[PDB]
Symmetry: C5
């Protein structure tokens, strides 16, 4: 346990993010574009597996998918690129610790979200171009899943988004709490396995699911209005999970009782 | 044989725990709540697996569940949060070695247990709101496991609680004996694999098994007395394993001539 | 972060490649022949798996193939040898950073591509002499995959090439951002799993698919023009993925404005 | 290479073991009882797996059991506790190297073996009390395995005991030759997978097999004479494996010329 | 790249090998006997797996065998012992680099191969003594594999030997290029997976195949003439793989010229 020094690290990470965005908007967006595409890469893989195993009628489908998703956030952490869902915790913590402002935060949130989206779009276009989604069980898996995510009640999506970002941000948190790159990756594998297989909802990952589906030639049963719906619900859920739970939580754990230079702890 | 070193570390962690509690009840409770929720997260995953593979008739169900539970304690150890079952060995070793009093130990136990339960209630509530336990195999898996755990005889729950916490605490003990975070996670993986697949009982994990089931409107036979009955029996077993075996054992190996 | 240091690292690597080729063509080409052979070894392993599981009607075939391909880039990275696809990002980043020139880049690309191919030819020849492709499902998996890769339309091949090298180059990128060799190998394993199972195309691996198919006794529809066609389409796609995305992207991330 | 430094370290461990026993019999026996229990925990896990998979008619049963046994020696090594079988190599090398006496070695063997059995006995008692061996495939697995282990000809048991302790002791030798805890656990995992799946015999793991089978009222296939018969023949082969092969061998590798 | 550094490490290792042999024949031979037996342990495990899964008609047999062979060379590398196949690259590179003579190289090859053989013979005898090859699918897997290896044409064996020792030697080369013991083991794992599942031939592993096959009364399918035929062809292939590819290749990469 050193929660204080962890709090200092999240604060420094928040500071550097806003400093970077102010410095170069292109640098910051390109960083966010990579991250969105890196996450999407995980989606292409596990949806391929979904199509493959669903068509075969395997009971192991959802387990294999979760076991296979680690690459999404592992690429993000190992490239040091900008992922919206992680910024929920980092910027929240930083702000409570007075390193960054509410404006600084909404800004990072806004642009990371947008750049991630750009990444998914580019990935979506390129993947469809491969013809792997022209016809088949994988194409169908994208179709069916895109539809289900858009057709499900806001409350359900909302809560799934909370639990997702608790898991995604806690893996990010572990990355702050260890110097071992291999331990980072392992904690990410565990958290992404738990979140994918348990059926929680990740906003950035969905950007690619719909990106691929709306760019896909075969029918739709998608209704881009649906994509927006899903994305709104999951995003707010994510924010709560990251900002309300992990951000505030790590702040509470690490803030020195002294200071006390504002507020007092029971 | 770093046994004296190890006991010095347990004792120091025990001291740090109670000082934290005395310094801040909110910080102690929040840390406890996180650890309760992180463990419950393991349960959500392995019960999803449980539902899926049970409904398939697979012989691999309990093996895959065991292999998949590592995240529970991995998250706890890697976040530095407060977990009741682990405090059983730490506070007992630290007390035997005169770093902390019995009152300190009793308090730390009461508070982490209550913190953990709070974490489980929040998780159980939020999980239910996802609608994932509304209906189907995962819902049924919660409903049936909760019931069999609440109706099992006391001596059996108790002895299962003993073996579980020997495994949970020995994995915490390993984390004190290595500087390698990967090796910590590996040993956690092994010990949680052994305890889940063998059929041992974890009090804090059960808190989520019960919060989910009770909070789920999809019908169940457990109730509160059922949940309380299991929790009491498993907690007592957990304490015996952690304190009487691991705490006393490590104190004996580590104590000064 | 450390994007600037990462760009410095790629620029330095890109500089050392051209300096090496300028000092010794033999060394450069020997290094390239090794890498081409190391990648092809991954192809032998997973096509053997392909032949085995396809024959069995397993739904797991492509998944097991992906999980088992890690050796291909792990060997290259752990031996420090010269792979054409990795050089798409390294040389493009170093070129934008003015460590090396465009001519340096096309020279390095030409030499590593050809040297890679020499390794593939050598490997295919020796593999055929083992008798392991004389007949049976492995021989058939080689014939069938070669045929389908060569008969696929250009656009599809090109885009699969793009996504393949994004993954391969981002694995190399990771190897520059960690001092942990285990972490390098793990990231390579994840990226190669993703690209093999997703259906993406790697020019250098395809060299072995084709040298094996064309050197072996078992009759196919492939021919030579087919191999060349596939290799042209996938190479261009690989170049776009490694150069336009990873090379340009890491340069933009690390460049002092 | 470091054969000399390795022998030095084995010698030192032999010296530290005898000193520990001389200083405190209790500390020594308690360490021994932990190790015997930790080994036994691996048996509880894999016999659970055995009952589940056998009951299912799985061809993978013995493979999954081997893969799942690593916890047994991993716990011992990571907690630094006293295991009879490892002491076959350590004491024999140490004695050969003039660090410890023949009588010292005899004493460490007797105490560690008996203390290990104390751990198995205690574990068997508690595990029976879980009700997990009451009736079903896990109880049948214990009962069937214990009977076949007690009815197997001496020669076959003895030789199985030799190969077993070459594997266990070589995994302890590896832990002496690396500073990476993660690599220690990997090597233990491999060697334990090899010995369980191949069919080799480990005296201390067997103590738990017989303690569970004998303490359980719903298991009557063996009795005590059957257990002694097996344990005597497996212990003798263990000794030969660890002392005559590993101990003598590493001494010959490391000794001053 | 650090190709010169690697060649220097290889050259130092060759020098150290020949000094060892010159210093003590007994030490050199004991070391070789260990490696031969450690490699054979891997054979005992994967042939138990082969017999189990072949008898069940599993498509996964050769895949699980390849995945399970890592112990063979992991033990050799972690105990620092003398393996003939590895010495093909090490002595070869150190010779080209003028650290050791052609005669030193012949000597080291001769002694390690014979020593490796002594370990295989001992392991064979003891394994037969376990009764584990008395009868059933494991004995039959041994009998059938020995026979197919004995009847295979020379060219096909030779080329299989080449590819096998590229893999074994590149895995040894990897261990000279990293300070991470976990990474060494991982690369060894991947290379042995590749060579076993693909169908490549390893001379020292084959020693234990024929050892068990010739010592078991219940295995009739082969003669000493067959074993010798296979061992000669496969050894020659191994030498070409280790010395002419890896040895010469690494010399070329690393030579200051
Ligand atoms: C909002 C939730 C707050 C939970 C705090 C629980 C307070 C318990 O407090 C402690 O309980 C122990 C026994 O149960 C006693 O032994 C201690 O003396 C006592 O301080
Ligand atoms: C409660 C546990 C008591 C354990 C006591 C074990 C002591 C055994 O005693 C030892 O036995 C050997 C042979 O039997 C002798 O050769 C040793 O000299 C002797 O010290
Ligand atoms: C060293 C091997 C393990 C020894 C275990 C001895 C426990 C015996 O104890 C008793 O004996 C009877 C038959 O054995 C059983 O029927 C009883 O249930 C059991 O309590
Ligand atoms: C158990 C006995 C094993 C002894 C093996 C010795 C075989 C030596 O063999 C020879 O050694 C010479 C130099 O020493 C080489 O020059 C020869 O090429 C080589 O054949
Ligand atoms: C089951 C297989 C998982 C293996 C994961 C290995 C991760 C180990 O961790 C790594 O190990 C190295 C030790 O050799 C260290 O040098 C590194 O610091 C460390 O990150």
């Amino acid at each position: 346990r050193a929660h204080k020094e962890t709090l200092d690290k999240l604060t420094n990470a928040a500071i550097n993010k806003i400093n970077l965005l102010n410095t170069s908007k292109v640098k910051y967006l390109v960083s966010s574009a990579f991250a969105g595409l890196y996450v999407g890469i995980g989606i292409l893989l596990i949806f391929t597996i979904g199509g493959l195993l669903t068509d075969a009628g395997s009971p192991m489908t959802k387990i294999v998918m979760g076991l296979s998703f680690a690459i999404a956030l592992s690429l993000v952490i190992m490239t040091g690129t900008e992922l919206f869902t992680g910024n929920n915790m980092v910027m929240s913590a930083g702000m409570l610790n007075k390193g960054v402002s509410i404006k600084d935060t909404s800004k990072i949130w806004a642009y990371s979200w947008v750049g991630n989206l750009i990444g998914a779009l580019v990935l979506g276009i390129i993947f469809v171009g491969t013809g792997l989604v022209d016809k088949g069980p994988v194409a169908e898996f994208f179709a069916n899943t895109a539809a289900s995510k858009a057709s499900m009640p806001f409350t359900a999506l909302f809560f799934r988004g909370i639990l997702c970002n608790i898991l995604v941000c806690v893996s990010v948190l572990c990355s702050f709490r260890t110097n071992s790159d291999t331990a980072k990756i392992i904690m990410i594998f565990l958290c992404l396995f738990a979140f994918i297989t348990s059926g929680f909802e990740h906003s950035v990952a969905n950007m690619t699911i719909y990106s691929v589906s709306l760019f896909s030639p075969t029918i739709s049963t998608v209704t881009i209005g649906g994509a927006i719906y899903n994305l709104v619900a999951v995003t707010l859920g994510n924010i709560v999970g990251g900002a309300l739970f992990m951000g505030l939580g790590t702040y509470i754990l690490g803030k020195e009782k002294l200071n006390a230079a504002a507020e007092n702890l029971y």
